[PDB]
Write a protein that holds these residues in place. Structure first.
Motif, PDB file in Angstrom:
ATOM      1  N   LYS A  66       5.748  -7.774 -12.691  1.00  0.00           N
ATOM      2  CA  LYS A  66       6.822  -8.181 -11.938  1.00  0.00           C
ATOM      3  C   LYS A  66       7.182  -7.437 -10.860  1.00  0.00           C
ATOM      4  CE  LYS A  66      10.729  -7.110 -14.956  1.00  0.00           C
ATOM      5  NZ  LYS A  66      11.697  -7.715 -15.483  1.00  0.00           N
ATOM      6  N   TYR A  67       7.205  -6.185 -11.220  1.00  0.00           N
ATOM      7  CA  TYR A  67       7.405  -4.935 -10.106  1.00  0.00           C
ATOM      8  C   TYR A  67       6.369  -4.933  -9.144  1.00  0.00           C
ATOM      9  CZ  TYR A  67       9.760  -3.988 -14.272  1.00  0.00           C
ATOM     10  OH  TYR A  67      10.673  -3.804 -15.272  1.00  0.00           O
ATOM     11  N   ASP A  68       5.132  -5.187  -9.312  1.00  0.00           N
ATOM     12  CA  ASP A  68       3.914  -5.276  -8.149  1.00  0.00           C
ATOM     13  C   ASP A  68       4.455  -6.460  -7.392  1.00  0.00           C
ATOM     14  OD1 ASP A  68       2.276  -3.219  -9.169  1.00  0.00           O
ATOM     15  OD2 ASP A  68       2.131  -4.353 -10.767  1.00  0.00           O
ATOM     16  N   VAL A  69       4.795  -7.532  -8.035  1.00  0.00           N
ATOM     17  CA  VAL A  69       5.031  -8.843  -7.107  1.00  0.00           C
ATOM     18  C   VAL A  69       6.190  -8.758  -6.384  1.00  0.00           C
ATOM     19  CG1 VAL A  69       5.792 -11.009  -7.544  1.00  0.00           C
ATOM     20  CG2 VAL A  69       3.748 -10.229  -9.190  1.00  0.00           C
ATOM     21  N   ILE A  70       7.409  -7.995  -6.888  1.00  0.00           N
ATOM     22  CA  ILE A  70       8.213  -7.633  -5.947  1.00  0.00           C
ATOM     23  C   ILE A  70       7.960  -6.844  -4.679  1.00  0.00           C
ATOM     24  CG2 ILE A  70      10.693  -6.273  -5.671  1.00  0.00           C
ATOM     25  CD1 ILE A  70      10.987  -7.151  -8.711  1.00  0.00           C
ATOM     26  N   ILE A  71       7.051  -5.641  -4.979  1.00  0.00           N
ATOM     27  CA  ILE A  71       6.675  -4.919  -3.951  1.00  0.00           C
ATOM     28  C   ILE A  71       5.930  -5.816  -2.780  1.00  0.00           C
ATOM     29  CG2 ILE A  71       4.828  -3.294  -3.402  1.00  0.00           C
ATOM     30  CD1 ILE A  71       5.758  -1.705  -5.816  1.00  0.00           C
ATOM     31  N   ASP A  72       5.066  -6.765  -3.200  1.00  0.00           N
ATOM     32  CA  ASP A  72       4.374  -7.566  -2.415  1.00  0.00           C
ATOM     33  C   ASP A  72       5.281  -8.355  -1.682  1.00  0.00           C
ATOM     34  OD1 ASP A  72       2.178  -8.784  -1.191  1.00  0.00           O
ATOM     35  OD2 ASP A  72       1.796 -10.198  -3.035  1.00  0.00           O
ATOM     36  N   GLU A  73       6.053  -9.144  -2.242  1.00  0.00           N
ATOM     37  CA  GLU A  73       6.984  -9.961  -1.649  1.00  0.00           C
ATOM     38  C   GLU A  73       8.072  -9.450  -0.759  1.00  0.00           C
ATOM     39  OE1 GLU A  73       9.159 -11.758  -5.037  1.00  0.00           O
ATOM     40  OE2 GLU A  73       7.780 -13.452  -5.319  1.00  0.00           O
ATOM     41  N   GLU A  74       8.237  -8.107  -1.041  1.00  0.00           N
ATOM     42  CA  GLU A  74       9.142  -7.268   0.225  1.00  0.00           C
ATOM     43  C   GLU A  74       8.483  -6.619   1.172  1.00  0.00           C
ATOM     44  OE1 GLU A  74      11.782  -4.939  -2.354  1.00  0.00           O
ATOM     45  OE2 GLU A  74      12.794  -6.620  -2.836  1.00  0.00           O
ATOM     46  N   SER A  75       7.015  -6.702   1.223  1.00  0.00           N
ATOM     47  CA  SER A  75       6.035  -5.958   2.086  1.00  0.00           C
ATOM     48  C   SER A  75       6.163  -6.528   3.370  1.00  0.00           C
ATOM     49  CB  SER A  75       4.656  -5.651   1.385  1.00  0.00           C
ATOM     50  OG  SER A  75       3.951  -6.815   1.647  1.00  0.00           O
ATOM     51  N   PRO A  76       5.487  -5.793   4.398  1.00  0.00           N
ATOM     52  CA  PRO A  76       5.292  -6.546   5.592  1.00  0.00           C
ATOM     53  C   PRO A  76       4.347  -7.508   5.570  1.00  0.00           C
ATOM     54  CG  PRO A  76       5.361  -4.251   6.097  1.00  0.00           C
ATOM     55  CD  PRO A  76       5.234  -4.378   4.447  1.00  0.00           C
ATOM     56  N   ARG A  77       3.469  -7.737   4.670  1.00  0.00           N
ATOM     57  CA  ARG A  77       2.514  -8.725   4.620  1.00  0.00           C
ATOM     58  C   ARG A  77       2.426  -9.208   3.266  1.00  0.00           C
ATOM     59  NH1 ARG A  77      -2.758  -7.989   6.434  1.00  0.00           N
ATOM     60  NH2 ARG A  77      -2.565  -5.629   6.338  1.00  0.00           N
ATOM     61  N   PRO A  78       3.377 -10.019   2.795  1.00  0.00           N
ATOM     62  CA  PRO A  78       3.133 -10.603   1.445  1.00  0.00           C
ATOM     63  C   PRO A  78       1.972 -11.411   1.212  1.00  0.00           C
ATOM     64  CG  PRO A  78       5.363 -11.113   2.349  1.00  0.00           C
ATOM     65  CD  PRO A  78       4.293 -10.737   3.140  1.00  0.00           C
ATOM     66  N   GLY A  79       1.215 -10.992   0.197  1.00  0.00           N
ATOM     67  CA  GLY A  79      -0.165 -11.770  -0.114  1.00  0.00           C
ATOM     68  C   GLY A  79      -1.280 -11.282   0.421  1.00  0.00           C
ATOM     69  N   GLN A  80      -1.081 -10.251   1.170  1.00  0.00           N
ATOM     70  CA  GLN A  80      -2.164  -9.448   1.634  1.00  0.00           C
ATOM     71  C   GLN A  80      -2.207  -7.962   1.026  1.00  0.00           C
ATOM     72  OE1 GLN A  80      -3.526 -12.469   3.347  1.00  0.00           O
ATOM     73  NE2 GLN A  80      -4.446 -10.647   4.312  1.00  0.00           N
ATOM     74  N   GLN A  81      -3.584  -7.540   1.183  1.00  0.00           N
ATOM     75  CA  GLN A  81      -3.590  -6.132   0.669  1.00  0.00           C
ATOM     76  C   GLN A  81      -3.406  -5.824  -0.676  1.00  0.00           C
ATOM     77  OE1 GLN A  81      -5.792  -5.361   3.952  1.00  0.00           O
ATOM     78  NE2 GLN A  81      -5.485  -3.485   2.601  1.00  0.00           N
ATOM     79  N   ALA A  82      -3.854  -6.907  -1.565  1.00  0.00           N
ATOM     80  CA  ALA A  82      -3.646  -6.707  -3.153  1.00  0.00           C
ATOM     81  C   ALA A  82      -4.124  -5.508  -3.650  1.00  0.00           C
ATOM     82  CB  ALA A  82      -4.077  -7.965  -3.820  1.00  0.00           C
ATOM     83  N   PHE A  83      -5.354  -5.387  -3.483  1.00  0.00           N
ATOM     84  CA  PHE A  83      -5.844  -4.103  -4.177  1.00  0.00           C
ATOM     85  C   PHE A  83      -5.379  -2.880  -3.517  1.00  0.00           C
ATOM     86  CE2 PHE A  83      -9.731  -1.201  -4.730  1.00  0.00           C
ATOM     87  CZ  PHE A  83      -9.767  -1.014  -6.223  1.00  0.00           C
ATOM     88  N   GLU A  84      -4.977  -2.621  -2.320  1.00  0.00           N
ATOM     89  CA  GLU A  84      -4.372  -1.522  -1.896  1.00  0.00           C
ATOM     90  C   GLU A  84      -3.027  -1.338  -2.327  1.00  0.00           C
ATOM     91  OE1 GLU A  84      -3.191  -0.603   2.495  1.00  0.00           O
ATOM     92  OE2 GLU A  84      -5.384   0.387   2.222  1.00  0.00           O
ATOM     93  N   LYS A  85      -2.206  -2.299  -2.666  1.00  0.00           N
ATOM     94  CA  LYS A  85      -0.717  -2.229  -2.990  1.00  0.00           C
ATOM     95  C   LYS A  85      -1.002  -1.817  -4.617  1.00  0.00           C
ATOM     96  CE  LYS A  85       1.109  -5.501   0.187  1.00  0.00           C
ATOM     97  NZ  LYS A  85       1.097  -6.925   0.580  1.00  0.00           N
ATOM     98  N   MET A  86      -2.062  -2.130  -5.307  1.00  0.00           N
ATOM     99  CA  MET A  86      -2.352  -1.697  -6.443  1.00  0.00           C
ATOM    100  C   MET A  86      -3.033  -0.373  -6.927  1.00  0.00           C
ATOM    101  SD  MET A  86      -1.042  -3.866  -8.748  1.00  0.00           S
ATOM    102  CE  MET A  86      -1.746  -4.001 -10.279  1.00  0.00           C
ATOM    103  N   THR A  87      -3.477   0.342  -5.776  1.00  0.00           N
ATOM    104  CA  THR A  87      -4.152   1.538  -5.880  1.00  0.00           C
ATOM    105  C   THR A  87      -3.738   2.732  -5.014  1.00  0.00           C
ATOM    106  OG1 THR A  87      -6.052   0.848  -4.571  1.00  0.00           O
ATOM    107  CG2 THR A  87      -6.440   0.622  -6.946  1.00  0.00           C
ATOM    108  N   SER A  88      -2.857   2.237  -3.882  1.00  0.00           N
ATOM    109  CA  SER A  88      -2.675   3.488  -2.829  1.00  0.00           C
ATOM    110  C   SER A  88      -1.503   4.298  -3.414  1.00  0.00           C
ATOM    111  CB  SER A  88      -2.113   2.566  -1.661  1.00  0.00           C
ATOM    112  OG  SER A  88      -1.131   3.425  -0.904  1.00  0.00           O
TER     113      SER A  88
END
Length: 467
Positions: free
Chosen positions: A265-287
């Motif tokens: 759920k925390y990764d989902v929050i990060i993605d929702e609050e990011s400049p491009r929700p739904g993009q860069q999934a693997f980058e958001k999980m590894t960077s």
């Protein structure tokens, strides 16, 4: 640790642990997505041909230049290849004038040509025996149909230089070089990760992949032309079906469909609050960029559920991205059981006083987040190796996480051992192993300039037919 925090620590372990079986399932899907990105229909992974169609032999010799255009500085690099997997290098960094980022095309290319002239006159005051081939690491969204070209798609990093977007930057630079009579030919324009692959292969002939593990993530490797459906019908006769082809994967977009990565759920929050929700999934999980943010959100959830920081003013913790990568880094490096460095970190920077048991939870959380990132990153490595049938490999790695994140090399090596279930004692003996890369944006661009000139001088293609 009380029963309450122990239960919460078990919850953290359930949230963030990635099993060997899960890694293997991620890898299978990753392979499918690598294949999909090379297909005519394409997929979320760009799988960009890099127009390097030969391996360096390590026997190359001569003087080659590289250029890299940063947001702050231009770096110019001279590389002297020694012909035994070896080289000497020197470089100058030139600060960009304040106005240049929002100036004109002429101003940009004239500035860069002026620096190149200063550099060449320093190192070759009596001139050169033949023109210096130059490779240009151009770290902005661009595409190319041949290596000696790059059409800017859009400026990023605060740049807004008029008259460049939609145009090929290579002739723009070359024209300014020629105006100043500098003996340089710009022969290649590259992504830095392609450079990491090629420079590392020149010095270490066992290199099978170049990988960047930092704020951004990327990987590059050599495929074969017959395995690239999307180039069918586009290639000249001198780039044949058995030809190698370097691929710049741009795999930060892997699993934007959200089918396999173990998002919480925390990764989902990060993605929702990011400049491009739904993009860069693997980058958001590894960077590395997000590791502190994951921790911040978990800690806020624990606070809201009544478990921690009960008598603290947690105001500073409510600021997104207040915890950068230095938080889990310093926490994992904290040497003693009472976690004094963590205590100082929280008190000083966040105004939060903690108990030892709370710091034990924070330390476990940092370890879990760093370990998950390493385990997911090596799924990209395993997918490339399995796709291409590399049973052994050196994986040439760079980036701030690989270089500086505590224990990352051990976390990644254990992750690969877990994926493959190797019966091997020492990390140094792992069949597939990460090793420190050579400099991709400098040395690698210069070496790619060398390989490109070999083909150019022969009249051999380095791009699509007719381009």
């Amino acid at each position: 640790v009380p029963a309450n925090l122990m239960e919460q620590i078990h919850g953290l372990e359930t949230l963030f642990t990635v099993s060997s079986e899960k890694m293997r399932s991620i890898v299978k899907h990753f392979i499918s997505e690598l294949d999909k990105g090379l297909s005519k229909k394409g997929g979320n992974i760009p799988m960009i041909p890099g127009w390097v169609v030969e391996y360096p032999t390590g026997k190359e010799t001569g003087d080659f230049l590289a250029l890299d255009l940063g947001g702050t500085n231009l770096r110019v690099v001279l590389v002297k290849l020694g012909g035994n997997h070896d080289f000497d290098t020197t470089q100058n960094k030139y600060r960009l004038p304040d106005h240049l980022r929002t100036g004109t095309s002429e101003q940009l290319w004239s500035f860069i040509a002026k620096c190149l002239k200063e550099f060449v006159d320093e190192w070759y005051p009596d001139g050169v025996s033949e023109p210096l081939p130059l490779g240009f690491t151009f770290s902005y969204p661009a595409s190319q149909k041949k290596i000696n070209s790059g059409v800017l798609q859009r400026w990023t990093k605060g740049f807004d230089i008029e008259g460049v977007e939609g145009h090929d930057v290579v002739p723009m630079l070359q024209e300014q070089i020629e105006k100043l009579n500098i003996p340089i030919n710009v022969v290649a324009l590259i992504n830095d990760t392609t450079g990491t692959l090629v420079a590392s292969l020149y010095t270490d002939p066992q290199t099978k992949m170049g990988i960047i593990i930092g704020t951004g993530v990327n990987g590059a490797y050599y495929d074969v032309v017959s395995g690239i459906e999307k180039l069918e019908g586009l290639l000249p006769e001198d780039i044949g079906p058995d030809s190698p082809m370097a691929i710049n994967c741009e795999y930060g977009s892997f699993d934007n469909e959200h089918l396999v990565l173990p998002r919480t759920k925390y990764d989902v929050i990060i993605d929702e609050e990011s400049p491009r929700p739904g993009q860069q999934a693997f980058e958001k999980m590894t960077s590395g960029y997000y590791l502190g943010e994951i921790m911040r959100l978990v800690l806020l959830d624990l606070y809201d559920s009544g478990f921690i920081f009960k008598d603290q003013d947690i105001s500073k913790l409510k600021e997104a991205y207040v915890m950068d990568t230095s938080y889990p880094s310093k926490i994992e490096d904290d040497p003693f059981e009472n976690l004094e460095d963590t205590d100082d970190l929280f008190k000083t920077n966040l105004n939060i006083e903690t108990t030892v048991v709370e710091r034990k939870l924070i330390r476990k959380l940092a370890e879990l987040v760093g370990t998950r990132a390493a385990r997911l990153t090596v799924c990209g490595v395993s997918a490339i190796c399995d796709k291409r049938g590399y049973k052994t490999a050196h994986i040439a790695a760079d980036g701030s996480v690989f270089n500086r994140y505590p224990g990352y090399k051990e976390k990644a090596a254990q992750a690969l051992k877990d994926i493959y279930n190797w019966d091997v004692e020492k990390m140094e003996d792992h069949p597939i192993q990460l090793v420190a890369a050579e400099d991709g944006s400098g040395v690698g661009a210069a070496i790619i300039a060398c390989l490109t000139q070999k083909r150019l001088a022969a009249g051999k293609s380095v791009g699509i037919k007719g381009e």
